[PDB]
Design a protein around this ligand. Structure first.
Ligand code: SF4
Length: 183
C-alpha cells in the first residue's frame, strides 16, 4: 500500500503512467462521481492489476461515488459496495476477474453517450484526440502520425506511439512500463 493506494492513484505521479483509456475513465469518475457498468469493470480491474488492495479499492470507489454529495454512503453501500467486493472475490466467488487487455477492451460494446469504457484511439474524434495529445506536449508531426495509426484501425500501435513520444497489448503493461521509467 506504500506506493499504490486509494490516495496515490489520484496523484499526478502515479496517474502520469496511465494509458489514455484509464485517464479517460478516471476523468469521467472525477467529473461525474460515478461510472456505468463497463467502465466500472474496466477501471476497477485495471486498478486491481496495478496492486490496489481490496480495502484501498473500497476506499477509492466509495469516496469517488459519494464525492461532492453525489450519493450518500448508505446508497453506495446498498447499490455498489457488493459489486466492487465481488470484483475482488470478497464474498467468496471464484470467478476469474483478471484485468482486461486491449483486445478485450476493444471487443466490449462500443461506448455510447455517458460511457467512458473503451479505447480513446478508436472512440474519440480526431479533434478530441489532437487536443488531448497537445496537452501531453506532442507536436503536430507526432499527432499526425498517431492519427494515421488511428485511421488505419491500429489502435494499439497508436497507443504505443504515444508511450514512446511521451517518454500482448495491455493497459497494465503500459502502466508498468511507464512506472518502471520513474524508478
Ligand atoms: S490501446 Fe489499449 S491501453 Fe492504449 S488506450 Fe487503447 S485500450 Fe487503453
Amino acid at each position: 500500500d506504500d506506493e499504490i493506494n486509494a490516495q496515490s492513484v489520484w496523484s499526478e505521479e502515479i496517474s502520469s503512467n496511465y494509458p489514455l483509456c484509464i485517464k479517460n475513465l478516471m476523468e469521467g469518475l472525477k467529473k461525474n462521481h460515478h461510472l456505468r457498468y463497463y467502465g466500472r469493470q474496466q477501471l476497477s480491474l485495471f486498478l486491481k492489476g496495478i496492486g490496489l488492495s481490496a480495502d484501498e479499492a473500497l476506499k477509492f470507489w466509495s469516496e469517488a461515488f459519494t464525492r461532492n454529495g453525489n450519493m450518500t454512503m448508505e446508497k453506495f453501500n446498498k447499490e455498489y459496495r457488493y459489486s466492487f467486493r465481488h470484483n475482488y472475490g470478497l464474498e467468496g466467488n471464484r470467478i476469474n476477474y483478471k484485468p482486461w487487455d486491449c483486445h478485450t477492451i476493444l471487443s466490449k460494446p462500443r461506448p455510447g453517450r455517458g460511457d467512458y469504457h473503451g479505447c480513446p484511439f478508436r472512440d474519440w474524434s480526431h479533434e478530441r484526440l489532437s487536443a488531448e495529445l497537445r496537452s501531453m506536449k506532442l507536436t503536430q508531426a507526432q499527432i499526425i502520425s498517431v492519427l494515421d495509426s488511428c485511421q488505419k484501425g491500429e489502435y494499439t500501435i497508436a497507443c504505443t506511439k504515444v508511450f514512446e513520444m511521451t517518454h500482448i497489448a495491455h493497459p497494465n503493461l503500459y502502466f508498468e512500463r511507464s512506472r518502471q521509467l520513474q524508478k
